[PDB]
């Protein structure tokens, strides 16, 4: 588990020097943008269950043999299996935006994911068609301004979408 | 070439994709293109007035237009106006491209050869391009006059 605050410590320990002033001016911008980061995080988790089924209205409608007899999302336990861990993508992507660095996500969520997905027999590439459909709905909610003070969180939006692209790359 | 085409070429000869520094360069060009286009429009407005004011500032009532000078014959006066219109027009093209390569490719290629072949005075040409630069920097403003004077001084420095 690493951070933005702790990773700029950990490489600074490996070189064994004191932290420079332009690294502290970098972290001062991280604190400054912290309030914006928090707001984005709360909107994802409050619409967390609404994203998953709305991704499941297209993850299964686009590749319709998967729930048809024969596919690996066919029976009911099998169907509840790709909702029990469609959300675990959202459970760890929201941990990555909170920490601000994708090192938390890599260790648990994607380290062994591509190995089980050929051991089980599930289509690995049929996951990353719908994790992209999560990202299309996640950045649509995080950007929309409802009852919120006007602000610019564009940088977060692009590197929020970078966490989904890392989440799709190691499965496909 | 462009500034866009120069950025694409510099990214291409390495086999590099478009990294963030190249995107910074292209976004700076896309920021400056507004005043680039407005400056090119108002320079295309009154190019003849700029050339007239420049020869009235620098070349007129000298010995150059007197007999013995290089601008005495009336075909040589017309050739002088043609050369100054060329310098202003190609400086406009280099200002709107944001890259001086078209000056190197189309104007400054074999120009010292020609001007030393014909006996054209080089220092009077440099002072005429300087007067062109002062007149168009007054006419367009300081903020676009800087970029106009950069390419006009490029022509003046390559000529010398």
């Amino acid at each position: 588990t690493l951070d933005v605050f702790t990773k700029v410590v950990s490489q600074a320990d490996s070189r064994g020097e004191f932290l420079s002033n332009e690294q502290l001016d970098a972290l001062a911008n991280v604190v400054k943008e912290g309030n914006k980061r928090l707001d984005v995080v709360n909107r994802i988790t409050s619409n967390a269950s609404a994203i998953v089924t709305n991704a499941a209205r297209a993850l299964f409608e686009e590749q319709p043999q998967l729930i048809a007899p024969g596919g690996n999302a066919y029976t009911n336990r099998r169907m509840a299996a790709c909702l029990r861990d469609m959300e675990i993508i959202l459970r760890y992507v929201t941990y990555a935006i909170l920490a601000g660095d994708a090192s938390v996500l890599d260790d648990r969520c994607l380290n062994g994911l591509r190995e089980t997905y050929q051991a089980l027999g599930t289509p690995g590439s049929s996951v990353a068609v719908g994790v992209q459909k999560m990202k299309d709905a996640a950045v649509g909610i995080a950007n929309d301004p409802n009852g919120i003070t006007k602000g610019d969180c564009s940088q977060l939006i692009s590197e929020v979408a970078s966490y989904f692209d890392r989440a799709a790359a190691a499965v496909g | 070439q462009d500034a866009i085409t120069a950025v694409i070429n510099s990214a291409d000869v390495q086999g590099k994709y478009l990294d963030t520094a190249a995107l910074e360069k292209l976004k700076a060009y896309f920021s400056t293109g507004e005043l680039r286009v407005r400056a090119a429009t108002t320079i295309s407005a009154n190019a003849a007035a700029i050339v007239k004011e420049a020869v009235a500032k620098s070349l007129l009532y000298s010995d150059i237009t007197r007999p013995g000078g290089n601008m005495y014959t009336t075909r040589r006066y017309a050739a002088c106006i043609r050369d100054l219109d060329y310098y202003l027009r190609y400086a406009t093209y280099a200002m709107l491209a944001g890259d001086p390569s078209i000056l190197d490719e189309r104007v400054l290629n074999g120009l010292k050869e020609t001007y030393n072949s014909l006996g054209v005075p080089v220092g009077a040409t440099v002072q005429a391009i300087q007067a062109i630069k002062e007149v168009t920097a007054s006419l367009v403003g300081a903020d676009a006059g800087k970029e106009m004077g950069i390419y006009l001084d490029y022509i003046s420095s390559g000529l010398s």
Partner: protein, 159 residues
């Protein structure tokens, strides 16, 4: 697109006509959307080459077949490298706004090159069509239209 208008008004002895200045101002306005589209196609390159090779080798199996050119791992790696090259030139054409810096590097002599390499050009056109389909799935509607623009130019050029 600025070099296009500049050599266009440069063949004439006239200046740049202010309608051309209007089109340059409009391209300058749209450059930010162009840069975002190019970065979105930039960071997701290996997905696009993977899905393009997917759809191509599903569509035409003769490159996979040993009589075809892209037989074996080395030849299929060269094939996906060619698709990577064409995606790179498409991003260049997306930034430049007009198809000159992509035709100058990928189109202008491609038929005799692929003829003296043995490869068919129609399979390359189908590969760029697969790249267009994958980028259409990757982007939004107004972004996929503007990407399928230059992808469409490459597909028309290779035929």
């Amino acid at each position: 697109i600025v070099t296009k208008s500049i050599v266009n008004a440069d063949a004439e002895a006239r200046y740049l006509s202010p309608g051309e200045l209007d089109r340059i101002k409009s391209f300058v306005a749209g450059g930010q959307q162009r840069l975002r589209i190019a970065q979105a196609l930039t960071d997701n390159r290996e997905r696009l080459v993977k899905q393009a090779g997917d759809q191509l080798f599903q569509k035409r199996p003769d490159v996979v077949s040993p009589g075809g050119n892209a037989y074996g791992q080395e030849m299929t790696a060269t094939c996906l490298r060619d698709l990577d090259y064409y995606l790179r030139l498409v991003t260049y054409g997306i930034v430049a706004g007009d198809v000159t810096p992509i035709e100058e590097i990928g189109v202008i002599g491609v038929r005799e090159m692929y003829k003296s390499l043995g490869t068919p050009i129609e399979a390359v056109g189908e590969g760029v069509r697969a790249l267009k389909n994958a980028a259409s799935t990757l982007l939004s509607a107004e972004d996929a239209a503007e990407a399928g623009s230059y992808f469409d130019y490459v597909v028309g050029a290779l035929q």
